[model samples]
Target: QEDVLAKELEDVNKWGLHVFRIAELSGNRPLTVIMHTIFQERDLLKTFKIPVDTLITYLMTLEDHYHADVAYHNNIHAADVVQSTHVLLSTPALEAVFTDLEILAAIFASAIHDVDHPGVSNQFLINTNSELALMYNDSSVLENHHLAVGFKLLQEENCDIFQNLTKKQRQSLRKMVIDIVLATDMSKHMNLLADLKTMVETKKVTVLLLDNYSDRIQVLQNMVHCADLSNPTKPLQLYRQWTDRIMEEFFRQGDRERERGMEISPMCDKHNASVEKSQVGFIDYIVHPLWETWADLVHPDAQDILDTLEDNREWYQSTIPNQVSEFISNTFLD
Candidate 1:
């Protein structure tokens, strides 16, 4: 994950110990580059007897579904999640975990988990009375949309990446995809973290967690969640860049809210760019606790990752204007 970039990307298979340059290096082909690289590293294509040439066609089209202009939730993010998921699965602590099929499911789930994201929260969809929210009963809206869009694209023969699977394998794959994506909704946040905490404290899989999982899907879900929410978990430079991207997307939504004469949403008001404070809150409540549980789950696995999270948090604390520091702490730390 961190090394001098090689054209062939050596040590590429052993990912996530470093910073990301795939978005810049692979550009037009980051998803395909990362996904194909993973499949090859794990020998998944060969093991499954999947057709590589055909798979590439499906992957390329799928990558196009991620809009590059959406600020944060774009092709870069999807490709990034795939890369993170790849290394998370590769951790030494996980050597005894995750069977081949399960690993396949985890990687694929991250690759398209946020496909077709509109760069706004589910609450945005609900308030606007969006048909997508209606379509999903206002529950797990983006998750539902991602699966529908991705699977439909896969349904086409030319893009049917799962074409090699047996009927039962296909069914298993579909269920895992749904479960992992469904777990991505922010409303499900605390429940998922609670489950992760349970998993860590007891290492006992929930009956609900074990229903179709190989004892790792729920962790895989957390891994996907971690990777997506890992902007601040990265090196300072890249972390700031992602914060900028998501904030841009947030303000765009704020602009939309203003146009509709609706109340501007939290973190969406451009003028109210409590931008710095807002990220601190997101890290406080969403990113930190959830990933801290994960760090406990796989201690040394996330040691470096967790350290970076702390480093970034400290960096923001020091870098933000001192006058607003008290404002941030008093306003957000609560």
Candidate 2:
């Protein structure tokens, strides 16, 4: 099991090398800041027995599939998500209860959870009968693929970070990793929240007691989900960057759907749609409930995040109506 910092560093160094490569190619300084943060995180994790070398190797391999030409769903976003997951998992309330093994699994899951993302949602891939859908039988295909590819890297000689664990320990870690990663699929958002809410209502103190795996797993799942939807909790500048990336990714998918003569998902459409409204819808419908539950779990620690989310939501609501229409008209006229 590894500590948070060690887990983050292992994942970042492995996954972030491509970010550095892209930065070098484009002469972008943003990647440098990202790289620095990752290195600092790695340094923090050194005290733990994390599979740093193995995790990094896995991340590098995953990067090979995130081609830059995809327009979005690229390596930078993956790094952002991993970094966000690290931050989310650091809540003091969570720190005492979750084991080092669970933390390692969560960070590892985040690092490679979106590998080879095609800028398309699971539904689109399934509808199109894309290779990914066929490969995973259309059930959270992208998420499944990510988990498979991420774990596959661990099979390599130098990359097995869990090598030192006992068989039972490795199995436990694998289970945690799979549950967290699979929950990232947007399709799973509602059900995941429902389960979290139910758990909260049950008022189980087992998680805090650290007495059983189920309670621990629930917390891990919520932690990962919160990390996945962490856009609103970030500083406004950083949050805006994520909004841009997701919208770009969504639009790219819309364009592909159009080209393929497939019906585009709501926000995927490239023209004459309210990207801001769609974002609000996504947050209201998808992101918020999950975060709200997480905020409840951590209370005061997450208050700042909750406040940021509300502010971001209002910002979107106030700006969407006029800005979207104008942007659409300008795009079509151009």
The CA lDDT of each predicted structure is: 0.76, 0.66
Collision count for each candidate, in order: 0, 5
Q: Which candidate ranks first by lDDT, i.e. highest? A: 1
Over 197-258, each residue of candidate 1 has an lDDT whose tens digit, in order, gives 88777754321224345456787888888777778887778788888988899789889899
User: Which TM-score value belongs to model 1?
Assistant: 0.88
The sequence of per-residue lDDT tens digits that candidate 2 reaches over residues 227-271 is 767766666666666677777777888788888887666666668
CA displacement after TM-score superposition, residue 56 of candidate 2 (Å): 4.1
Question: What lDDT is obtained when candidate 2 is compared to the true structure?
Answer: 0.66
Alpha-carbon shift of residue 43 in model 2 (angstroms): 7.7
Per-residue lDDT, model 1, residue 167, is 95
TM values, all candidates: 0.88, 0.79
